[PDB]
Symmetry: C3
Subunit: 341 residues, 3 copies
């Protein structure tokens, strides 16, 4: 029975940015059309230049954020070009049936498939490849995961009948990676994903990542690729982790409104210091910036954040508020008449 709704083609953009969308809408349900192209390729994952045999949707880790509204249909064309070596598929945690779509989307290199799923559940959700068996974790931790956001048609709210609107949105995909080392402790390089598999599975089995990165590599979202904001802006930070827990924290800020389980039918928690993304999920936090300067956005296992790659920066423009915080006395020599024992 043909589905007779308007169609809208969406052009995806690379994370941490997000394709243009409306928050609140008075449009009715549409068939929202997306295309994802699998790309297997070697990628650089850390500041020392370590390479990795990655597998991606659309060439990025994470895959791009898709945004629709409650009641829309999502029609995804998944493409597996013949330059790839592996079969792939896609599982939407937002979707109902057939293992999230994985049981309807298995494609060999040289094939494509078209899946439609109804967006009946609001929130942010993981999507990931899941070919079967041990290939499921391997494809996911090789980079084959992203997220989809299903907004209420009226946009976000605080769970107490007040509208919430973001000025800016960023998507932070966190990736646990498992890179083999040689006898001397150096990371090993491989010429194909298949050649990396056996050694990689051994590292995976011990459940300790070698790297934990945002946007696919250590330092991806620092330096010149820091995330911009301004004092007074309400920023939505979507965070996903398809395989392993995370504990996001905005250093020098808070989560004003946090859906740590990621589902907008639940009221957000207020005023959090650190929240928790359970592996296999996406969550989201709103924050209104109150101070200018550099903020570091981390997982608050600080070892992961500082030493395995999992730090992003915000650079926030505006005027400093000395009522909220001030340096009363700059560093000075301890007074000779001090005690301090």
């Amino acid at each position: 029975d043909d589905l007779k709704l308007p169609r809208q083609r969406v052009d995806l953009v690379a994370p941490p940015f997000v394709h243009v969308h409306e928050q609140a809408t008075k449009q009715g349900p549409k068939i929202m059309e997306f295309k994802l192209v699998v790309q297997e390729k070697k990628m650089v994952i850390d500041e020392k230049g370590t390479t990795f045999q990655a597998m991606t949707f659309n060439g990025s880790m994470p895959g791009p954020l898709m945004v629709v509204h409650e009641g829309d249909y999502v029609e995804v064309t998944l493409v597996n070009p013949a330059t790839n070596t592996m079969p792939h598929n896609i599982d939407f945690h937002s979707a109902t049936g057939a293992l999230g779509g994985g049981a309807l989307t298995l494609i060999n290199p040289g094939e494509q498939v078209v899946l439609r799923w109804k967006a009946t559940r609001t929130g942010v959700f993981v999507y990931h490849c899941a070919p079967g068996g041990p290939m499921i974790p391997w494809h996911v931790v090789s980079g084959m995961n992203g997220a989809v956001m299903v907004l209420p048609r009226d946009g976000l709210n605080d769970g107490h009948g007040h509208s919430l609107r973001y000025d800016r949105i960023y998507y932070i995909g966190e990736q646990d990676l498992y890179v083999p080392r040689d006898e001397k402790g150096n990371f090993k390089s491989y010429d194909s994903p298949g050649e990396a598999y056996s050694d990689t599975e051994e590292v995976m089995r011990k459940l300790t990542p070698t790297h934990v990165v945002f946007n696919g590599k250590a330092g991806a979202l620092t330096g010149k690729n820091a995330l911009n904001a301004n004092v007074g802006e309400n920023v939505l930070i979507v965070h996903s982790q398809a395989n392993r827990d995370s504990r996001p924290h905005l250093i020098g800020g808070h989560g004003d409104y946090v859906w740590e389980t990621g589902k907008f039918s639940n009221a957000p928690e207020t005023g959090l210091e650190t929240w928790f993304i359970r592996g296999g999920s996406a969550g989201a936090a709103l924050y209104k910036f109150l101070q200018p300067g550099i903020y570091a956005y981390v997982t608050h296992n600080l070892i992961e954040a500082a030493n395995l790659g999992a730090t992003a920066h915000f650079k926030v423009e505006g005027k400093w508020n000395d009522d909220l915080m001030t340096q009363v006395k700059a560093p000075a020599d301890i007074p000779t008449g001090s005690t301090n024992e």
Copy 2:
């Protein structure tokens, strides 16, 4: 001062099934009588036939689910037959005082003990052995843990004054296991729990399980022992983990109503993709099946799920709903006029 209430003897059944019970009841408080018999025995824990020196309540991992109502008394006869080698006891996280009952239930082989605890707290709760000191984790990770459910007398509700009723209930006990390996990486076998202890403690200390299983072994709840359901049924899935965190996910479904901390005085969260069972607790999720087919129920560390044992299946009978999901175009060769870069 004798307690003058009606007595009801309950016959426990092996997980993942649950003894017969009422959800809502107009019966008053009763003394609900249960018996648990400790059994130390070698068990098979994975598809390659690895054996393990297990210690169990009632011969199963997990121990059986006990179900009572708020205000009932629970009178447990704990039996430690003289064929066992170790002292054992029982700690109910549902109970108040004496380390959950552990300080009143320590029995040598050849002894039994009778503990009564009042079910003053609603929810699902862990029970476990806890003899003292380093024996506490060892007995728990050797299999000596289960769960108890204390239902409100009016049954479950959504926290907004609407009754919730399940058509079916399953109990998923997740077990982290720590099996020693020899110099070549093969799992070691032992002739007794005591002989396994020193080598097992060394693996335990590094906090990385070798196996993470549902119902005591990899593949326990797949193949012919898949969990049955039908389209339209509301299924309650109780999940426990006595020692280590888990992140349950129903692949192709959701948690319609989830008590991830497991306590029915709190309203459930709605529409979750993945939830979180903190180690040392039980949680519960309701889901109404909307699509037929195979569903995989996992912890969403996919390495744990696919490679360490932690996958169950549901086989759901009914009619496919093409409005919720459909394969618009089956796999086909990428059109020659396609781009895809």
Copy 3:
């Protein structure tokens, strides 16, 4: 523009105790003055006498609990005596701007600094050192972390308009430690923090602690330093973990009211068995003791609790309530007419 409020100097006390404070107050906002003195020193961390090159605020792990009210200003003098070897600073997760204060408080040995932050966010919050880069995790896991509590001016409430008042408060700071071992597996000793660093970083990178302790050492809060309470007392247990997740559980009790994300703008959950402190946060639980005796307070990874150091005790005075729990029959030989198969 000078801030013209009354000033109040607070004398901090060593954990697990808490400086005197009011729960509800009709005082207006004050500038609450605190001093923290960094101390680098070797400390004993386990029952076998293992030593560790620690770095602390005020000589303790955790640093002391600071207590203020919503709307107060907190003026902290941070002192780094010239006997220390390292630069230090302080990041308050309760504060807004400048990386929580870290970007305004970096002091060399022989210096001090004065930071003021407005207590605009209610809850319990971590504070920690964060000098920069890989020094951030190293200083934190060397002991440089504590917590601050920002109470509502009306004190705590249940989120349903009922006041909650504690009779007693304890602060449990949990510390993950990473102690190097030699080729034979023995813990290594060092003459300075700098000399320990390279070997310690290698252990940190594998993300598995060697020790997980409360109040700075295994057994700190057992034996003669057990935590006292009485039947009928409502006890607030503040728990922090600056780097790694924890799952607190009171063995033989419950969490009557739990803010596991730690922020008093959110209603607490009721009747929990086990709760979850996400690494980089503090949470809090109220419990009214109903039974006398020993209680063990653990992280419910029981391996961590029994074998890596993470057990505290409460010793509770009062009268046993046989209605809540009783030993119906003491241990006895299994009756000859028993079956039990």
